[PDB]
Every structure is written in C-alpha cells, then in structure tokens.
Amino acid sequence: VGRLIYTAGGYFRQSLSYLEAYNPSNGSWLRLADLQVPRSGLAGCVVGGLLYAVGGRNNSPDGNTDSSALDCYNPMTNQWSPCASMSVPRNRIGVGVIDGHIYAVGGSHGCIHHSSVERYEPERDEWHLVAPMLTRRIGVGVAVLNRLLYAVGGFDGTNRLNSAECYYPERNEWRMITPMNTIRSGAGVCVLHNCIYAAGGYDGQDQLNSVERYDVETETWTFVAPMRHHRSALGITVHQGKIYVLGGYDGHTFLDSVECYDPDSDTWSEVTRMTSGRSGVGVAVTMEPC
C-alpha cells in the first residue's frame, strides 16, 4: 500500500492530535480525522492498508501521560478505532513491521528506559513480548530489511548511543551490529534498497543534519549528503525510492520543512511544508482516503 504520506500527532507547545496526509504527486495536504488522544514521540506504520499510531506521550496542559495505545486508522472510512494496548507505555518508541506484524521497541515510561520489545498480530488483535534488546533505548530508530529488524541509536537514560542491533525472528535473538559513526538519539531511521539510513537526531550537543547509511552486506556505515536543515525528532518515510523527512526540532524552531533525498543524485531538496511546524510525529505511507 503506497500513495499518501500520513503524519499523525506531534508536538508544538503541547502534544497534537493532527492527522494530515501529503500527496507527492500534486503537492496537496489533506486534514483527516484527529487522533482520539493527542500524542508526540509516537511512531506510525501501515499493515494491510490500515494506519497504526503506536505509543507516545500526551504532553498536555493538564499533565504528561505516557501511552501504551495502539490506534488504527482506516482511510476508507476516515475513522480511528482503538486496537489492543501494549503491555507498557512507550514514549519515544520505535516501530517496525515484519511480515504483517508490528514490532514496538524500547521507549520510556516515567524515568524508566525500556529494553523490552513486543509484537502485534493484526489478525488476532494481540500483543506479545519478544526478546528484549541488549540495550535500553528511547528515541530509537527502527527499520526492517530482508525480514530482520534493526534498532539504531537512542538514549539509555545516561548516554545517547551510536550502537545498533539486529533481531532475527526465527531465533528470537538480538545481535550487535557495527555502531554508527555518530551518536544519535531521535534520528529518523529508514530503509532504501539494501541500506539502513539514519538521518539527523541529537548527539548530546547539537541537532544533526548528517545522514549515514549501513550496507548490510559490508557491515559499514558511510555518510551521504547531509540534510539542508539540522533536525531531531523528525518523522521519516520512504516513497517511490526517495526518503522524506518531516518536521523536527532544530534547537531553535519546530520545523515545518519537508525534505526529500534522491539516492541516484545523492541530493536533498525541499519539497513542501507541513501546515504547521512540529516535532515527534508518527509517519507512514498508504492508500488515499475519501
């Protein structure tokens, strides 16, 4: 399923309930049905044509509540429906999809940083815990390549991380991979062709514009062209062989900037602006609604 880039939730002054969809074919944004509960630091993904908003925190005028929610959006009806909740709240979560199943990775609850990981079965509306990561990680980037799930960077409560690890589902087992060249928490992580990209993030001192990619075959990370804007807590997704990065915080502004990376030319371009600047959104790609 692939036609619109959906952005759900986020933060500007407080957590947001926005669901908006961008159409790269015509440059158009649609406002869709609001999330039932505002959240930022959530992740998005799509399975069987449904959009899922996972985890996050409602950082609101009347409190901060970490979310264990899994909510499902149907583009055919333009409606949100609650799905089964995770075992635990997970703010600044990372999510990946392997073979129709959603993996929820790390994230925080209050002062605790999770190494736990759980897997959702859409057909059964059920979550189950799997092997935890080797490291506690929040603000972790996650991507899936060749039916293996990668957890990249993050913050363990004490240090931001350049480390990454890979989960082999048939062995329910995590293994370290080559660390990134840069410490990144809150980076955008995604897969394009045979490569895992990690774009932006925060290294403990600055929001980053640098972008590196891991070749699973060579087990090395190599920098590619940097983004035009430094940004952390950005949203990221892939559409038609190009990476799109959405919003984020640059140490000064909550960005409305959307940039697109073309791997053929190794260039980033500005493609559009979100309707308002914001960080911590969940992003995914699926069919247009009605």
Binding site: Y11, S40, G41, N59, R92, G139, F155, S185, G186, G201, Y202, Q207, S232, A233, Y249, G251, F254, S279, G280
Partner: peptide, 9 residues
Amino acid sequence: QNEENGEQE
C-alpha cells in the same frame, strides 16, 4: 527544554 525533541521541562 528537551534538546532532542524541543518539548518543555
């Protein structure tokens, strides 16, 4: 302010 996501604190 959280320097990773810009949120208050």
